[PDB]
Each structure stands twice: as C-alpha cells, then as structure tokens.
Amino acid sequence: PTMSGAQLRYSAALSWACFGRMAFKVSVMSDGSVNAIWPLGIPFLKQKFDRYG
Amino acid sequence: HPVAFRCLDKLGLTVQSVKWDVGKDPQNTQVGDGGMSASQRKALQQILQRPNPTMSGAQLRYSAALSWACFGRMAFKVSVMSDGSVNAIWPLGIPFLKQKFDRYGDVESFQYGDEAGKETIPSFTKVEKNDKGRPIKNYAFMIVKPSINGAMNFDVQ
Amino acid sequence: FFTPQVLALEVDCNIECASLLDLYGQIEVSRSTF
Amino acid sequence: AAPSRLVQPGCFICRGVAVS
Amino acid sequence: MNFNVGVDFPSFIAWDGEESFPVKVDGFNQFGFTFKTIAALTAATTFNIFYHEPSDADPCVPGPAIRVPEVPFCDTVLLSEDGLAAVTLPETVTPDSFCAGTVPCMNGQWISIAPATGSETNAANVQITVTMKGATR
Amino acid sequence: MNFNVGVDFPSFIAWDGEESFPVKVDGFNQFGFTFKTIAALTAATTFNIFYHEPSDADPCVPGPAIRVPEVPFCDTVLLSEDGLAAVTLPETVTPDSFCAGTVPCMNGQWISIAPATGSETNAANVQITVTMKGATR
Amino acid sequence: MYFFSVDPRNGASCCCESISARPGEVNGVMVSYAAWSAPLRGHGLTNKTTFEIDGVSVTPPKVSNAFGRTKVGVVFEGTLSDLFPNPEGEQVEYEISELNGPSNGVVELGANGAFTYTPGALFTGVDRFWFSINGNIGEYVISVDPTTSELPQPPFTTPVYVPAARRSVDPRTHVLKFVLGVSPAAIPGDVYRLTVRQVAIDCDGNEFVHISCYDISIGSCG
Amino acid sequence: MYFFSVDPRNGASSCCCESISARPGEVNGVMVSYAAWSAPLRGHGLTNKTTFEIDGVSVTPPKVSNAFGRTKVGVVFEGTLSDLFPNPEGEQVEYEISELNGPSNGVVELGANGAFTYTPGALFTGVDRFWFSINGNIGEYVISVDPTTSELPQPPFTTPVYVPAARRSVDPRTHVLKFVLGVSPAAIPGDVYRLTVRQVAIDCDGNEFVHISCYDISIGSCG
Amino acid sequence: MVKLNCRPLCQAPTASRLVSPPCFICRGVAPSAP
Amino acid sequence: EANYDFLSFMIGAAQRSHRINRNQALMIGKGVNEPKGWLTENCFPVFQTLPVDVNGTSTPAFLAQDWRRFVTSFPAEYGEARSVMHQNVFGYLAAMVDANGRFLFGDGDLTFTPDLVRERIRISNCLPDPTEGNTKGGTGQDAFAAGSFVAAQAAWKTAFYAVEKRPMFFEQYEGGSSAWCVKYQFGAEDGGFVGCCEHGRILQI
Amino acid sequence: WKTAFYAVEKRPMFFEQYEGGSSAWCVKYQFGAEDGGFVGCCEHGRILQI
C-alpha cells in the first residue's frame, strides 16, 4: 500500500542507474502467495556472506 | 519568472486537456470484480467529471499536475457518504500541508492548518472501512514521486 | 486511596467588552503605505 | 472643529401674565 | 471527613525566622516551598537556596552547604547576575497570603533556605516550610 | 522534573518550639499535621489541639482558643478522660523520622497545637507543622 | 595574554624574557615548545612541567599579614593595629580596599584599627580581605568552620604565584598554557624570576628536559 | 557616549589612566571593550562580577553645607536656608532655587530672605530632593515624605560623582562592558576624580582572570 | 528559576454607591421675575 | 503531560488579547505604533451641554432633552447613523425623573427596555463613560466632572475606515526551538484611519 | 444563578430500623441523607444595600 507498480519500477531503475544494484523484499504468506513487495534503500544496505561463496 | 511560468502553464494546460472516465481494466484477472456496487462506480464517474462545487474536473487536473511538477506531490480530499459512494473531491494546498507518521512505517493523518484549522484527516491506510474494504469517512491521498535511498515518504522532494 | 469524581465544568467570568468592529468601513489592502 | 454649544429651549410657557 | 494528608505529602520547617534547617528530600522526588509572612514587610526580601551532600563521616547527616546553580527555561531575562538560584519575596504582601515556588532541578540529598545579605532583619518576619510528594522508598 | 507544590497542598507552621501559630483551614477542606523531632526526648510528650472562630470584631483574625472535642472511631478503647482531643508523641522516636496525625472531623476555621501542661520541658525539641489538601475558593 | 616562542637549542639585554605585571591582575601565559619538541619526534609533550619563583628584589613588607578563626554564622571581630609596627610616630589611616574586600561576608571597619566580620549565612570555608595601613597592603584571612572541629590553615598566598592546577599542554601543537596571578600586596618596582622545567618524552618512554627562565617586573598601572 | 579599548596585556601596545570629561548635572554612558584582552582567553566570556570605586585626587571642599528634613504625607513642610552658608567674610546671600534641579514630585517657592516651603504633591510618599544655589555655591536639601505611619530611613546624600547602583551590563558575545556615570549638580568645576574598574573573566571550568584599569574623570564646566 | 504564586486567604468585600440622576431643573422658566 | 491542553489555551488567549486590543486601538490609539483613533484625533464636530443652576451652584448636568437634540440634529443627507455609548449611560437615561416624580421613559414599568436596533444605539461598554464606571454623575452636587465624553454618532460605514493587510498567523519558529523546547511566534498586520471629519459628532459636558 | 451558585445532589433520604439497641420493649429508627453545594465565582451577582 501507498505505492503502485509504476513507482516501484521507477525506484528500481533509478537505483540501478546510480549504483548498478537492485534490492527488494517480499512477504509471501505461507504458500508461495506473495503478499507485498518493498523497494530497499540501497545506500545503507549491509549484507553478510556465507562461508562458501 | 517568464520562461519558468511559461513551461509550467504549458505543462498544466496539456495535462488538463485529457478526458476522464472509469472503465474495465485490461489486466482484469480479478474475476471477483471490485466494482462493489456498480453505483459507487457511477457516482465515481459523476465526481471525476463534476467535482466539489465551483470547480470542474479540468481545474482539478490542472492544479494536480501543476503541484506535482512544482513539488513532486499530490494530495486530495474525499467525502464518501456512507457506502463507498464518494461525494466530492478537493485538492489540498501542499505548501502548508503537514502529516504525521505511525510507529511502524507510514503516515496516518494529515493536519491542514496551524492554529484554527486542525482537521486531522486520516489517511487511506487507517480509516473506517466497509465490510469489503471501502472507507466510510474522509481521507487523503498524498501521492509522492520516488527518489533514491528509498524513504518512501521520509525522503526529499 | 480516595479518588475524587472529576466533574466536567469550567467556570470563567471574564467579560471581553463588546464588539465595535463591524460599524467601521472595511477595506482589504496590500503591501503597506497605501 | 471648536466645541460648539447645544443651547436648547428652556421652560417656555407664558406670554400674557407676568408673575408678581 | 478529612484524611491523614500528613503521610503522602509531609512537610517540615525550613526557616522559622531565626535559624535555617536542612531538610532531606532523598526519600521523595518532588518538593516545593510555601512562603508566609507574619508581619508587614519593609522592603523586597531575598533568600538564597542551598543544597547539601551526605557527609563522609556519616551518610545520615548533611555535610557542607553548597549553593544550587540557576537553570533558565526560555523566558528568563533577569538571570539574577550570578547563576545562583534565589527567591525574592516582593513588597506589599499582607500577612494573610502565602506564596509558592521551587527550583526546577534538585541536586544532592538536602535543601536549605537562608536570607541573603542586606535583608537579614526583615527575614525575621517570614516563615518558609517545604512539602514533598510521593515517596520513592 | 519536580512540580511547584506550594499551591495545591501548601504548608504552614503550627509550633516552632516556642510559640503556636493559628493556621486558617477555611479556604481548604482537608488538613493534617506532620510531627518532627530535633533531638532525643526524655519522656512521652503530649500536645493539645485547639480550634478558633472568626473574631467578633475582625472577620479574618482568629478569636479565642477553644479546645476541639474528640470522637470515637468504631473501635476506641482509651477514651481520653475529659472527652477532649490530644496527641501523644511516643518516647523513643529518633530524628530523621516523622509521623502524622489528623483530627477526624473539623470544626471552626483556625486550628492550633499547643504543648500540654507537664510536658512543655522536652516540647522545645519538636516542631509541628500543618499541610492542607485542596483549595475550595 | 602573553606568548613566548622558546629557543629550540640548535646552537643558533638579559637572557630571561620580560613580563610586565600589575598588582591585582591574574593573566595567562602561552609558550610554544614547537621549535624544540618537533624535531624530537616522539609522543609530544607530557604534563610534567615544574615551576619555581625566586625574588631578586623584595623590599620586605612593612605591614604583617594575619589569620583568624570562627564558627559558621558567628560574627568575628578583631584588631588591625598590632600588625603595623611603625618605626616613626605618626597617624594611621586604616582602609579596606573595596576592590579586594571579602567575598562571602561584610566587614565594618571602625574608626581605630578595629573591625567586625559577619560571614554570609550558611557559609563554611576560607575568606580573605586586603587592608591598607598608610598605603602598606596586607591580607587578613578568616576561616569559618562548620562548627564541628576546624579547617586547615591557608598558606598566605605569595606576592606572585602560579595556581595549583590550571595548566594545560596540547601535545598536538606543542603549546603550554598556565596562569600567572599577582597578589594585590605586590610592591611596584620589584622583580621576580619564574623558572620553568618542561619535560618531553620519546617513543620508548625516556625524557628530554628543557629549562627556561622569565623575569617578572611588578609595574603600576600597566 | 564614551568608548575605550582597554590594553590587551600583551607586553606591547601623559598620565596612564585615560581621561573622561563631564559637565555638572549630566548623566552619560560609557562602553569598554575587553575584546583585545579576553578573546585569546578562550572561556565563557565575561561575568557580572565587576566592582567600581571612586576616589578624589582634588576636591576643593564645598562652601555651603547640605541639610536633611522629615515630614509626613500631605502635611506642608517648612524650612530655612540661612544656616547652610558658612561665610568667613561678610557678603549678601543671593538665595536661588534652580529651575532645572528643582523637586521632582512636589513644588517649592523661594522666599525673599532664606525662606522656602515644600508642599508635596497629594498622595505621594518617598524621597524628594532639590538643589539650591547660595551665591553661586550649590548644595542640596533632601526631604523625605513618610506615609504617616512610623518613620522613614536616611538617604545617603548622593556624592558629586557616582555610578548608579544596578545599571551595568555585559555582552559575552562581543566582550563589551556598559555602565552609567552620573555627576551631581553640586560638583565644582576644575576638580578631578579617579574611577577604577575590576573586570573578571572566566575560563571553561569556572576559574577567574582578573583585570584592573583606571580612568580620570575631570569635572569641567561648559562641556 | 523560581516563579512565585500568591493567593489571599480572606478576600475582602467591595461596596459602592448608586448615585442616580436628580429631578429635573430647567434652564430658565419663561414667566418669571428678576 | 498536564492533561489540561495548554497550547489550545494560549492560541485562544492570543486571538482574544488581540481582539480587545484592536478595538481599543481604533478608538484611542495615539499616532505612532498604533492607528490614530477617532476619539483622540478629535475631528468630530463636538457638542457640549450647558450646566444647570442647582440653588445657584451651576453644576454640570446632562438631561434627556439634550440627547434628543443631539441625535435629531444629524443632517439626514449623510445617511442613516448609529449611536454608540456605554451601558451605564443608557441606564442613566432610563432613570430620569421629572419634578412630579414619574419616569420619562416607560411611565411605570419597573424597567425601560426599548428596541435598541430600532433606535440605532449600539451599547459597547469600553468607550469612556461619564459615570466613572458607576458611583459618579447624577447628583445635586459633587459629581459630573465637566468635560467628559458621553456618546457619539456617525455614518460609520464612511466616517471611519478599518484597514486589514495580513491578519493573525501562528507558526512554529524554527530556530531558537530545540528538540526539547518549542518557541511559537504569532503576528498580524492591520490599521485604521478616519474617513471624513465631517460625518461624525461627539457629545460632551 | 445558573452559573453563580451551584447545588450538589448525591443521595436522598433513607429510613431503616436500628436493630442493635431496639429490644422487644423499645424500638429506634435511623435516617440520614447526603448533599451539599458551593459558589462558582461571585462575579455574576450583585446585592442592593441601603
């Protein structure tokens, strides 16, 4: 809510243009039925790697 | 400014030229149609062509596009009577429009006025909904233009 | 241990004076020194 | 304007009999 | 039907007109003064506010008397030229009228009031006591 | 954050060890005493309670000293001999410790405390004070 | 505020520098040890400075100082005539310099070498006031005790002094700061000498000592 | 409005104390800028712990003496003016009550031979002064009107040159001291007094930096 | 920063008179005598 | 905290303080820093009544006969004009008595309450009243301080104009307000002047 | 008067036979009510005296 697919596409491509990255988040209920999508602020996103690759 | 005002009124004029209507959407996979009553859709057709008195839909389109171009924002006001049937639509002055956020992630109400005007119009998020979901009391829109680093509503224009 | 029943009255007694601003001629103006 | 008086007619009654 | 308001807001004497008294405010969290005169005053009287600290010899007896600093909120324009909080009982106070006041920030364990220099002969005609609020322990 | 509690439960002096002071309880509707000792006592100390009336001449100065009677409270046994109120600060009450008594039903408009006869020797070490509860102006 | 750039000891009228002083002032002094400490690359300076004051012209004081004692709240009275032994026979115009009066009480100077000192309400500590007999200035110190036992006896501050702990040294720019106060009993024309021993440190924890001197001249009105 | 930039105590840049010219009666203001001295001493600026002292190096003691009276509210007060001019030689006494320095909350009429009457204004209590001029020599006659209850205290017989009780100020943002200097109408032209000022700054932790300076006030008539 | 707050214990009454216009006199009666 | 909402009390106690101040200014405002009021400018043609000889004393007075000549003498060519006065004055006229003892208005009703808007009187009890509040005026002697003000009359829609430029506004004064204390700032801009000295009138003693 | 003086109502009267103290030869009743009032702000009222 408070965001349509047009705004999501805009934010995704903009972050893809400035940083070359795209991040998102899903809220799949229990059975592959995805409930909501959120675009993720790429500047202040930190990630942790596994041991292999 | 000469050139700035010229480009703005051109942009407002052209957008004001299009003609509205409610219609069946192409990507209608929802066989459980959201045309809740088919009368609110008629009234919505009424309101899109005849908004709040002393204002037409054309002037609404002009003010919306003009404000969207100037500030990157669009706000409005509805008067849904009791059954999802919208009564009237009002544009809101963005420069002196303030909003308050919830604890989790979003805006809940809009304050319009400093001292006497204190109508804390609820957002569409939290409002008395019908059994199907359609609201019953007033709310606002706060259409926003995206920007970098997310902050859907907390970001800079 | 005893909580008083907070009644919902608020006394005042503070006359303003009286209105006398509607007799005069009213003219809305612009930037000062008209 | 200078303060002007407001002399009004007094007790005017009679025209034919003077008092003693 | 009046209550034993003594417990739950007790009170003690802070200035009996002849000598001061340190009052413990540790067991409570909020407090204030209630000035009261016994005879017509002659000039504006000023009292100094002091806070104590538990003495090293015994933690149940106040040590030396330090002076509480002054805290302005926003509206303060006088600042009392010293940065040291003080009260000033104004002239023309008939001796059937009390006046209330307190410091915005306590510090230490005790509080004391004493007449400032110059107005030490008029303070003999006033009474200052302190009442606290709910007890923390 | 401490509140200015001088208004809304003010406090006044009633016995500074040398003189009683009638306190007006008309403008308020509840009141109580808060005893406090300054030094170790010698024996049990007994105090009388007095209530005053508006004087015949001046209507807000206290009149004579009338002693308020005492009433039982559904389980009384002692029943002070001459049906008259009295408070007895028990022996072996240390300093930095306060009690609180209160006459159950009020009469008059000025209340006062005085050291009972035969007990005014070690009565100079106590200091009774009063605190009211709620203005009714 | 004074400022001295010290010589870095590179082999490249008097030796000690000149500092003017006025009776009563309390000024500040800066020294820039950068020239001497920067080549000695280490951990900069260390707060191990030591001062020493000597007098090369004293003109011993005519009037002697004095000390008293009293309990808190209790008024203190004393004499002011047995402190000025006069060689000749003349009159004595006692005076309490208003600029150097007490700080927590008031003094009622009588007509003839007598005074009474009423301390401020609820005050326990030390207090000083600088009298002046026939122009000769001397301090009188009074200690108000908190009625229990006593307070120690203050050290009768010297004509020129450096406070106990108000010095600071910045190891990032090699500058030492301190305070130089001149008693109101200083005598114009006198000259003192302040020797400063500043210690640096190497990267391992050894010392580099450095010594300088300064000549203070007590001059009136600037 | 005088303005002095005090010496910065840096060992660098006739009488030492500066000069100040004043005319009897006037009340002026003076500014002092301690910026050159207290700005390098990085602290909390100045403090309102200044002290002033007025000493006279030339007085020429006055000829006429002053006088103090007592009276209540509304009651007329009478007094003479002949026992206030001790004349070593014989001369006439041209009594005069200057219109400029007359009473403030009352009214007086000068008699022909050392007489005057101070009828105070109705419903007024306090202290009121007025300056007489006996044969060019100037003095003051101070009267206090009591509200008929008990009595009033004694006023301090204002000095020739004075600094008001509490009108000083200081702005720690620009390191400037402001104070008032008032001269009595009885000051004799040609004399000179000395004013000393003790200004104390403060470091970051609450210690003190003292500073003393002096000013020569020469009371000169006609500017 | 202590800010005092004072109330009076015994309020006093406040009397006042109620002067009313007098009976008419008129500025000279016509039939009259010197 | 402090359950009683204080902010709403202050904004309410600011428009109120203005409302009485603007009314007070347009009447007796003195030149600089306040609009020149029509009471202090003194352009209105002012009429003063004559005294009456109470047993040869000539005290100032004001009788019902004066009030009629003051309202009817207005030239009807200026238009319809209203009269403003203090409520004690209107009570003063209501209590007149003739030599025989009867009342002149409402000849026996215990009260005189006429239609005011049918008589154009517009009582507003902050104009100066000649009764010194009350307890003065209407005497045999020792009252009625001569030279006072009683009432006015004018074609107010053209005899005095009110100027409004930018009325009251409230705003959080960003700057000087920190994360723990707010500083509000309110303001308004208005003024007034007289229109035509030759349209009003003033009655005096 | 609607805002010059106030009257407070809590409970009307009651009546009940006092059991303790009423033997089979005597009998004693017992009653009482509870009410009160105050004055709001005496700036809305006048008094005409002589």
Numbering used by the authors:
A (entry chain AE): 106 to 158
B (entry chain AF): 54 to 210
C (entry chain h1): 174 to 207
D (entry chain f1): 10 to 29
E (entry chain m2), F (entry chain l2): 1 to 137
G (entry chain P3): 1 to 12, 21 to 230
H (entry chain O3): 1 to 13, 21 to 230
I (entry chain e): 1 to 34
Can you quote the paper on this entry?
Caudovirales, the taxonomic order for the tailed double-stranded DNA bacteriophages, is characterized by the presence of a tail—a host cell attachment organelle that is connected to the genome-containing spherical or elongated capsid via a neck. We describe cryo-EM structures of the neck, the neck-capsid and neck-tail junctions, and capsid of the Agrobacterium phage Milano. The tail to capsid junction involves a symmetry mismatch that is bridged by the neck, and is therefore crucial for the assembly of tailed phage. The extensive network of disulfide bonds within and between neck, collar, capsid and tail provides an exceptional structural stability to Milano.
A 3-fold symmetrized map focused at the neck-tail junction was used to understand the interactions between the collar and the tail. Finally, a no-symmetry-imposed map was used to generate an atomic model of the complete neck. We describe how the neck 1 protomers undergo structural polymorphism to connect the 12-fold neck with the 5-fold capsid vertex. The 12 ring-forming gp14 protomers exhibit structural polymorphism. Their β-sandwich domains adopt different orientations in each protomer and can be described as 12 steps in a continuous tilting relative to the α-helical domain. When the α-helical domains of the 12 gp14 subunits are superimposed, they display an RMSD of 2.6 Å, while the β-sandwich domains have a varying orientation with the maximal distance between their distal parts reaching 24 Å. The β-sandwich domains are clustered in three groups with 3, 4, and 5 members each creating a 12-to-5-fold symmetry adaptor assembly to bridge neck-capsid symmetry mismatch. Five out of 12 gp14 β-sandwich domains (n, n + 2, n + 5, n + 7, n + 10, CCW direction looking from the capsid side) display pseudo-5-fold symmetry. These domains are covalently linked to the MCP (gp9) by two disulfide bonds, gp14Cys117– gp9Cys252 and gp14Cys120– gp9Cys440, which emanate from a head joining loop of the β-sandwich domains. The head joining loops of the remaining seven gp14 protomers are not resolved in our maps and thus likely to be disordered. In summary, in the gp14 neck 1 dodecamer, the α-helical domain connects the portal to neck 1 ring smoothly while maintaining C12 symmetry, while its β-sandwich domain binds to the five-fold symmetric capsid vertex by adopting 12 different conformations.
